[PDB]
Write a protein of this length. Sequence first.
Lengths: 314, 314
Amino acid sequence: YFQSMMKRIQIIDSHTGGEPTRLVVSGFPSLGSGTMAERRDVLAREYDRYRTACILEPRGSDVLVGALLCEPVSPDAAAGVIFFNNSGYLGMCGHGTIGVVRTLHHMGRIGPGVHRIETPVGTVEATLHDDLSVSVRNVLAYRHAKDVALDVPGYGPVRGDIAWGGNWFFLISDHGQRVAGDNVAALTAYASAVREGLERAGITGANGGEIDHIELFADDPEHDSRSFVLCPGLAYDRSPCGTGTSAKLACLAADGKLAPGAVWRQASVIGSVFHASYVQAEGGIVPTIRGSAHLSAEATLLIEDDDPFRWGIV
Amino acid sequence: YFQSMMKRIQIIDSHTGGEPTRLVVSGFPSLGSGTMAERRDVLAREYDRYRTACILEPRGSDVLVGALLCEPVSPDAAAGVIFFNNSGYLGMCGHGTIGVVRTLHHMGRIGPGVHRIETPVGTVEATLHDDLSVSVRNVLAYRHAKDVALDVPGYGPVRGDIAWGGNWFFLISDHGQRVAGDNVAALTAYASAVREGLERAGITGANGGEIDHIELFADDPEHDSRSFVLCPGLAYDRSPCGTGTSAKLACLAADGKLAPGAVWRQASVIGSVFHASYVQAEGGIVPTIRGSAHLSAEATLLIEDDDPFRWGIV
Ligand SMILES: [Cl-]
Ligand SMILES: [Cl-]
Ligand code: NA
Ligand code: NA
């Protein structure tokens, strides 16, 4: 019923292990009634300024990940979601699905139990536990290649795995870097160089898929592993990375290093933790990631018609 | 009347020429009834986690500047304000005062006209024009030293002025850098090195004042000048920088390059613009900065008691 000359975008912000999720409850344009993938294509092609308004400065930051709530195609699903970041659109998003599901509870839309969530890479099954933690049974994960040699410009040779966990990842253990929260500047520079190296080498996932997430793994006395993860827009993931941990489990499974049902405890560069396990499937594994999200803001974004930076600063 | 186990901070976000201001309307602790400077001391010493919760990730970003609304000491003032950023506390804040005053109009607390605003460095006089632009008559500005030689580590010799405009600035024209929005990475690195150089040299403002803002000036065919400004937490100012432009006018005045009452049009690295003029005063000049602010969000920040990152990620 408001009539002033501005758009209102209703959002609820949460974070999962420190990684933010900006849930868009209302205010984006219609994207039609097709699959989440088809809607993502319309959003990206026709209405990308809505992403930038929500994610980029002045209203956002390069770290943020957004989640657009959509009516799902199947009436058996709780929701559809399209995830996006400072550079573009994600496939699946583990930390974000945890955030969305926790947020839907706060909105009074769901209770504890199993909830199907449609995404541009397929439907996932999220269990909202009685403690309000969330387990996300992800799409199929698999390793495309193992121990791929790469000369990292400015640093020297490494070996990495290429794997899909709902996004494409390059996974490295022999990077020679110090994985710690006080070292994220150097880690960001290193991982950015890795990605430049993959591009130069023409190294890709299946069917030429761009490898746009980089994971650096390290031993951790308190957990199974700690990682630093560089995301497609060159911000790092504050969380253990749900899709990246899914990809890691595909590698561990294929190497006989983690049995089905066994729990893997993955820490992020800042010390937050996800619990993960998998079952075998045809062509890969089906991993489940469990973590917690906390609410951090309820807001209405205001997009004033006369504001030259209404769609963000690009 | 809410009773869930979380704190609520009510905020209204705006931006001034792209530079954000997060106005805190309610939710911070009591800081006593002294001057804004005395309240700032209490906030910084006892309750700094409230700054980090509002400004830092996950709820904020390194770019944000906050403004805490306070009841002023003098009943003749519209408001008192304490400004803060990702690293600490500012003195005056030009873009932020424009934001605060525009926001107070939106809140229905003031109308067009002249409004006194108390700050930790003295009271300023803001005029809210009928067009909702704001002129801020700043505190006294003055130049402390001219053409100070500095060997910038990694780059080579420059000359800069040291001046106060409500914060301390080093102002350089002969930096050899390209002042443009597509070059902010290199400008940030250069200005950071300048500041390292000042520290090494023991170069300060009056009474050993830390020079924590760096301004790089360039000619501009559309304006009097364009600048890149590095702020104390090493984020850059998206605006022309009200206090930095105030400092620039003190230098121009002292050099006989701008007459009292003449208008100076200062652009920022991303192309936003302030209009500035001054009058002579004892010991310096009194500059007035005019610009516009746009609303960008209304929000309640949620600080959950059980959220390990409730006070921000440090
Ligand atoms: Cl609009
Ligand atoms: Cl709390
Ligand atoms: Na361990
Ligand atoms: Na000019």
